[PDB]
């Protein structure tokens, strides 16, 4: 079940001049179980930018294609901002209509070093993007791809007119983000990202450190089957 994956909600709130977020979601296990995670992110524009009020980004992220050892992976994402209903039942520039990105990630999980280079594209106002990721070093990865999927693009969220789009407004200079993922079994991921615009292309530079994953746990043993809310 990698296609038509469930929607996950990033809870955005302004704080200390930054846009922060929380996700309290987890990985589906092959054995039908749940592997819970908390994600805290801080996004900070490189220039001063209008902050929105707190709001929700609904995200659908799919692995649409991969080779046999996940050293080539294709990911697709649909993201849309919306107002909180406060517990009620919900209802229905230099940034062109089409934009490419390039991503470079340097990583280590449980001390296994790896490098991923990717190229993506999509429609920043229509809530659509794809990327093709290639493991250039440390491949094949001896851990679940799922832990990396959400580290690969905030400019491609459709915002309604009334919600300031912090990510689009930050360009061309862009924004940095710092993320901690805490898994229920002691697994920790720390991510630092720099997002820029160079020659009409988004440039993503990602540093990732994963540690304290149990060697027999679902990440190191590749027992995960995508994210759920």
PDB file of N, CA and C in Angstrom, residues 6 10 16-17 27 38 45-46 62 83-84 98 101 108 110-111 115 129 132 144 151 154 163 183 190-191 202 207:
ATOM      1  N   UNK A   6      -2.598   7.369   2.990  1.00  0.00           N
ATOM      2  CA  UNK A   6      -3.517   8.231   3.724  1.00  0.00           C
ATOM      3  C   UNK A   6      -2.953   9.654   3.871  1.00  0.00           C
ATOM      4  N   UNK A  10       0.137  18.349   8.762  1.00  0.00           N
ATOM      5  CA  UNK A  10       1.184  19.134   9.461  1.00  0.00           C
ATOM      6  C   UNK A  10       0.516  20.357  10.112  1.00  0.00           C
ATOM      7  N   UNK A  16       8.136  32.730  17.877  1.00  0.00           N
ATOM      8  CA  UNK A  16       9.495  33.318  18.019  1.00  0.00           C
ATOM      9  C   UNK A  16       9.981  33.872  16.671  1.00  0.00           C
ATOM     10  N   UNK A  17       9.085  34.375  15.819  1.00  0.00           N
ATOM     11  CA  UNK A  17       9.430  34.887  14.477  1.00  0.00           C
ATOM     12  C   UNK A  17       9.624  33.797  13.424  1.00  0.00           C
ATOM     13  N   UNK A  27       4.479   4.972  11.364  1.00  0.00           N
ATOM     14  CA  UNK A  27       4.654   4.025  10.245  1.00  0.00           C
ATOM     15  C   UNK A  27       3.757   2.814  10.482  1.00  0.00           C
ATOM     16  N   UNK A  38       6.721  11.400  16.668  1.00  0.00           N
ATOM     17  CA  UNK A  38       6.413  12.843  16.840  1.00  0.00           C
ATOM     18  C   UNK A  38       7.408  13.596  15.964  1.00  0.00           C
ATOM     19  N   UNK A  45      12.563  31.805   7.331  1.00  0.00           N
ATOM     20  CA  UNK A  45      12.907  32.598   6.128  1.00  0.00           C
ATOM     21  C   UNK A  45      14.261  33.277   6.350  1.00  0.00           C
ATOM     22  N   UNK A  46      15.033  33.489   5.288  1.00  0.00           N
ATOM     23  CA  UNK A  46      16.392  34.093   5.369  1.00  0.00           C
ATOM     24  C   UNK A  46      16.265  35.629   5.402  1.00  0.00           C
ATOM     25  N   UNK A  62       3.273   9.584  -1.687  1.00  0.00           N
ATOM     26  CA  UNK A  62       3.334   8.215  -2.272  1.00  0.00           C
ATOM     27  C   UNK A  62       4.741   7.932  -2.803  1.00  0.00           C
ATOM     28  N   UNK A  83      -7.475  26.220   6.956  1.00  0.00           N
ATOM     29  CA  UNK A  83      -7.832  26.726   8.305  1.00  0.00           C
ATOM     30  C   UNK A  83      -8.227  25.532   9.158  1.00  0.00           C
ATOM     31  N   UNK A  84      -7.791  25.531  10.411  1.00  0.00           N
ATOM     32  CA  UNK A  84      -8.314  24.681  11.508  1.00  0.00           C
ATOM     33  C   UNK A  84      -9.827  24.891  11.620  1.00  0.00           C
ATOM     34  N   UNK A  98       5.269  26.341 -12.936  1.00  0.00           N
ATOM     35  CA  UNK A  98       6.086  25.102 -13.032  1.00  0.00           C
ATOM     36  C   UNK A  98       7.491  25.418 -12.522  1.00  0.00           C
ATOM     37  N   UNK A 101      13.358  21.317  -8.923  1.00  0.00           N
ATOM     38  CA  UNK A 101      14.286  21.414  -7.778  1.00  0.00           C
ATOM     39  C   UNK A 101      15.368  20.367  -7.930  1.00  0.00           C
ATOM     40  N   UNK A 108      23.596   9.919   7.789  1.00  0.00           N
ATOM     41  CA  UNK A 108      24.077   8.763   8.574  1.00  0.00           C
ATOM     42  C   UNK A 108      22.942   8.242   9.459  1.00  0.00           C
ATOM     43  N   UNK A 110      22.422   5.221  12.266  1.00  0.00           N
ATOM     44  CA  UNK A 110      23.086   4.192  13.108  1.00  0.00           C
ATOM     45  C   UNK A 110      24.526   4.084  12.602  1.00  0.00           C
ATOM     46  N   UNK A 111      25.072   5.200  12.130  1.00  0.00           N
ATOM     47  CA  UNK A 111      26.468   5.290  11.683  1.00  0.00           C
ATOM     48  C   UNK A 111      26.675   4.750  10.285  1.00  0.00           C
ATOM     49  N   UNK A 115      24.661   9.079   0.716  1.00  0.00           N
ATOM     50  CA  UNK A 115      24.430  10.308  -0.069  1.00  0.00           C
ATOM     51  C   UNK A 115      23.315  10.015  -1.071  1.00  0.00           C
ATOM     52  N   UNK A 129       3.911  17.740  -6.690  1.00  0.00           N
ATOM     53  CA  UNK A 129       5.350  17.578  -7.000  1.00  0.00           C
ATOM     54  C   UNK A 129       5.733  16.098  -7.079  1.00  0.00           C
ATOM     55  N   UNK A 132      12.762  12.196  -8.278  1.00  0.00           N
ATOM     56  CA  UNK A 132      13.491  10.944  -8.515  1.00  0.00           C
ATOM     57  C   UNK A 132      14.757  11.060  -7.697  1.00  0.00           C
ATOM     58  N   UNK A 144      14.706   1.382   6.453  1.00  0.00           N
ATOM     59  CA  UNK A 144      13.449   1.709   5.755  1.00  0.00           C
ATOM     60  C   UNK A 144      13.614   3.029   5.002  1.00  0.00           C
ATOM     61  N   UNK A 151      11.714  13.940   4.245  1.00  0.00           N
ATOM     62  CA  UNK A 151      12.857  14.894   4.313  1.00  0.00           C
ATOM     63  C   UNK A 151      13.140  15.485   2.927  1.00  0.00           C
ATOM     64  N   UNK A 154       8.745  22.586   0.693  1.00  0.00           N
ATOM     65  CA  UNK A 154       7.599  23.345   1.288  1.00  0.00           C
ATOM     66  C   UNK A 154       7.036  24.380   0.303  1.00  0.00           C
ATOM     67  N   UNK A 163      -4.435  32.914   3.446  1.00  0.00           N
ATOM     68  CA  UNK A 163      -3.309  32.447   4.310  1.00  0.00           C
ATOM     69  C   UNK A 163      -2.005  32.843   3.635  1.00  0.00           C
ATOM     70  N   UNK A 183      10.894   8.616  17.514  1.00  0.00           N
ATOM     71  CA  UNK A 183      10.156   7.338  17.379  1.00  0.00           C
ATOM     72  C   UNK A 183       9.925   6.761  18.779  1.00  0.00           C
ATOM     73  N   UNK A 190      17.583  13.855  13.349  1.00  0.00           N
ATOM     74  CA  UNK A 190      17.855  15.310  13.306  1.00  0.00           C
ATOM     75  C   UNK A 190      18.157  15.651  11.849  1.00  0.00           C
ATOM     76  N   UNK A 191      17.444  16.631  11.304  1.00  0.00           N
ATOM     77  CA  UNK A 191      17.593  17.111   9.908  1.00  0.00           C
ATOM     78  C   UNK A 191      17.817  18.618   9.936  1.00  0.00           C
ATOM     79  N   UNK A 202      14.818  25.455  -7.578  1.00  0.00           N
ATOM     80  CA  UNK A 202      14.971  25.286  -6.116  1.00  0.00           C
ATOM     81  C   UNK A 202      16.193  24.402  -5.853  1.00  0.00           C
ATOM     82  N   UNK A 207      21.178  17.789   5.530  1.00  0.00           N
ATOM     83  CA  UNK A 207      22.076  17.032   6.428  1.00  0.00           C
ATOM     84  C   UNK A 207      21.169  16.237   7.383  1.00  0.00           C
TER      85      UNK A 207
END
